[PDB]
Amino acid sequence: DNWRYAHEEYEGDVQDVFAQAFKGYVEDNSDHTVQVYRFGELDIMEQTQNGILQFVNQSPGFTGSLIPSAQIFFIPYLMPTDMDTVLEFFDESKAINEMFPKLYAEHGLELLKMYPEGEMVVTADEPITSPEDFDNKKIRTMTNPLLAETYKAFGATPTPLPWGEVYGGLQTGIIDGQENPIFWIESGGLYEVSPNLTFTSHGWFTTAMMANQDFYEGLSEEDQQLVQDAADAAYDHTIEHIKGLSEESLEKIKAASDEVTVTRLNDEQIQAFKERAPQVEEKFIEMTGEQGQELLDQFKADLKAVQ
Ligand SMILES: CC1=N[C@H](C(=O)O)[C@@H](O)CN1
Ligand SMILES: [Mg+2]
Known about the structure:
Helices cover 47% and strands 20% of the residues. The protein is α/β, with parallel strands linked by helices and 307 residues long. Strands 1, 2, 3, 4, 7, 8, 9 and 10 form an eight-stranded mixed sheet that branches. Helix 1 packs antiparallel against helix 10. The longest helix is centred in the last third of the chain and has 28 residues, at 278-305. It is globular, with a radius of gyration of 19 Å. 45% of the residues are buried.
């Protein structure tokens, strides 16, 4: 059988690294093939739900509209900063490994893996050392509601847009900045048009890979185990790939542009942004009810356990 798999990124990007590894495992261990569609190579979620696609990698930044609980990742300063700790969290969290698959199942998706890509970094037309610096800045967000609220809380004017629109928008001042992991900033050449990088440490770009649930459930026990085994292999490979990635990417950027500036928020400057976080958490709960409170409680507990 041929299994169609779509993701959000380009050749060599983090999602593609995961994809290619997944594909590789399946092909190496079965008679099956995985057909991977990169960005633009085809609404990938719609296409998965209606069964055109078997697998899809979509980030909560988008999925958060359809699956409100997925917005949890956009609560600033909830997630740790340390790669090692984040990795431990993803491996061991019941929120991630037990609860979220339940939540996705409600939408007819079989959540296979959630994984981090990189720490979020702000880019803009100036350094941003304080919420005040955000004032009257149109900052692009991915298209989920909580994420807009986050940026509003930070003092910006959130402008949610599809990825396709971002480079151009920056270039002609439709937007004043955006947020993304460094590897994407680099691979996407965003630094060319948004040269001031600020490390706010407010969170991580994360993503998820899943299967159409009917498809998955429709597979033989053997093929199910294959898929699981492949996801585990891809995860492992991808985690190895991201170690040192941000550091390499930043070097790449510095090599490419003399105009790039890097601002790293100190502990004091961080607390100021952190002051804005609780209001976002409150909104999250108002969006997701008791089910949401339960997830958040587990999330926080999980975090505590790895720290
Ligand atoms: C890191 C990443 N950023 C894009 C975005 O910000 O829209 C996503 O669409 C895909 N991957
Ligand atoms: Mg084969």
